[PDB]
């Protein structure tokens, strides 16, 4: 019954990740194009007593980045499930900054499928 939120500020990137998840046997995938929209979707799911097993969150987005989005989601909504950074800079420095915002894992872009598979296995509850 896995449900996943994919937050990426480009539709193309979103479809790449959705396809990856689909190939891993996950079909219930929602999309958000920015940090606020992401918060909105978690809040809604939250309005329905339901929740995402995992969120994949683009770090570098305009208006509201993935750090802010993460903190809003955790603090205001009480979401304690895994939020995984989608990042272009896997430098140890930025990786800590993501952790400090409330994220708990990372996938570097361009996303590599085997890394995505490992993240799912390790952190996604109920994942086949």
């Amino acid at each position: 019954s896995v449900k996943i939120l994919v937050v990426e500020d480009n539709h193309v990137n979103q479809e790449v990740i959705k396809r990856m998840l689909n190939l891993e046997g996950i079909e219930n995938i929602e999309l958000a194009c920015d940090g606020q929209e992401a918060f909105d979707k978690v809040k809604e799911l939250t309005s329905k007593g339901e929740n995402y097993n995992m969120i994949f969150m683009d770090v570098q987005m305009p208006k509201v980045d993935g750090l802010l989005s993460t903190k809003m989601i955790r603090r205001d909504l009480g979401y304690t499930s895994p939020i995984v950074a989608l990042t272009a800079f896997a430098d140890d420095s930025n990786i800590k900054e993501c952790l400090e915002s409330g994220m708990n894992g990372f996938l570097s872009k361009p996303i590599k499928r085997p890394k995505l598979k490992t993240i799912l296995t390790e952190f996604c509850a109920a994942y086949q």
Partner: protein, 156 residues
């Protein structure tokens, strides 16, 4: 860094293809997104001249192009962003840039200026260079299409 020599980073695109209609569909989405984005950049150049929006548009196309391995397009986008942040104040000309191509024969039988547009204050310098880079991006887009078309045995 400078501009990559290769139009396509197959190491990146192969990941997407390993998931294959899917990749072709994705490439077609990209192609539409690029045409929109360029048209938006042009509109800004001729109208509002908002450097901040040109930065934003560059950010958006960079993410897509990079993910598909269209690394030359991605590089031009990143220059557009820097120009728009006023961090750079030069941009190379078309000949210089095409002279770095890994396979220059892709240019035989095409006018490399075919898709050029022009436009008409501190900001003028930057706007002009962004216009120049946009023209570069149009060529890079066409070249990417040519290569992708030959790979998929179909005009994209």
């Amino acid at each position: 860094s400078t501009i990559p020599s290769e139009i396509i980073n197959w190491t990146i695109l192969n990941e997407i293809i390993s998931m294959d209609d899917f990749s072709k569909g994705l490439i077609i989405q990209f192609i539409d997104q690029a045409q929109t984005t360029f048209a938006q950049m042009q509109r800004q150049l001729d109208g509002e001249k908002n450097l901040t929006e040109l930065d934003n548009l560059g950010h958006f196309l960079k993410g897509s192009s990079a993910a598909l391995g269209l690394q030359r397009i991605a590089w031009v986008c990143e220059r557009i962003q820097n120009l728009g942040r006023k961090m750079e104040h030069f941009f190379p000309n078309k000949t210089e840039l095409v002279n770095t191509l890994s396979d220059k024969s892709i240019i035989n039988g095409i006018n490399i200026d075919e898709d050029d547009e022009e436009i008409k204050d501190e900001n003028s310098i930057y706007l002009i260079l962004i216009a120049k880079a946009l023209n570069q991006s149009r060529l890079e887009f066409k070249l990417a299409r040519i290569e992708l078309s030959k790979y998929y045995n179909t005009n994209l």
